[PDB]
Every structure is written in structure tokens, then in C-alpha cells.
Amino acid sequence: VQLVESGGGLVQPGGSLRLSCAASRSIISNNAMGWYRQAPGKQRELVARISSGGRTTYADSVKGRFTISRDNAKTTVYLQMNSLKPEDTAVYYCNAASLVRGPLDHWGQGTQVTVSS
Ligand SMILES: [Cl-]
Numbered sequence: 001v002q003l004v005e006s007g008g009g010l011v012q013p014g015g016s017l018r019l020s021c022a023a024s025r026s027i028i029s030n031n032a033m034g035w036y037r038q039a040p041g042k043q044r045e046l047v048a049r050i051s052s053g054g055r056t057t058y059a060d061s062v063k064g065r066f067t068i069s070r071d072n073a074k075t076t077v078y079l080q081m082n083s084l085k086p087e088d089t090a091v092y093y094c095n096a097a098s099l100v101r102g103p104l105d106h107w108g109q110g111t112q113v114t115v116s117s
């Protein structure tokens with residue numbers, strides 16, 4: 001099960017990035033999917049989730065700024081990240097986000113996000 005992340009970058013505070021998570025339709029269409037992130041000195045944390053039925057939920061810290069979505073084909077999960085803050089700096093990873101099981105038993109390489117002057 002490949003999880004292929006892209007869309008990171010280095011931006012100024014107030015900037016934007018769009019992350020993409022490419023995976024098999026068998027995974028993305030049948031499971032809740034999430035975007036997670038991990039900064040130096042901190043644990044990995046879930047910041048956005050989209051249920052298999054399309055219901056979105058967000059960490060308080062990103063509400064109103066980040067939007068998670070699926071594409072038509074259900075082969076990419078996007079994270080639009082607007083109004084970026086220094087505190088958003090982290091490596092971002094996608095995975096399943098089951099309410100019962102959490103993520104899959106492995107992780108992709110992630111995509112790097114740095115928000116800095
Ligand atoms: Cl920028």
C-alpha cells in the first residue's frame with residue numbers, strides 16, 4: 001500500500017500550499033483518510049480527516065485555514081493550507097484515519113512544510 005505525498009515547500013507566514021496524497025482507490029475510497037504532521041521535538045498529530053462518505057473534521061489549530069478533500073477519482077486526498085503560520089512547520093503525512101483502527105500499519109515518506117520569514 002503506497003502512500004505518496006507531495007506539495008510541501010518553504011513559504012512566508014501568510015502563504016499557502018496544497019498537499020496531495022496519492023494512493024490506491026481501494027484505500028482512499030473505502031477508508032476515512034487523514035493528514036497528519038510531525039514537527040521537531042513533537043509527536044505526530046492528526047490535523048484533518050475526511051470520512052469515506054466525505055465528512056470533514058479538523059484540529060482546532062487549523063480550522064478555517066486548511067481544507068481536506070478527495071478528488072473525483074478518489075485517488076488523491078488534498079490538503080489546501082491557507083494562511084500558513086510558523087507553527088504549521090512540520091513534515092506532513094497522509095494515511096488512513098479510522099475512528100476504530102487509526103492509520104495503516106505503515107507510513108509514506110511525507111512532504112516537508114516550512115513556514116518562515
Ligand atoms: Cl510565500
Ligand SMILES: [Cl-]
Pocket residue numbers: 008009110111112
Ligand atoms: Cl518534500
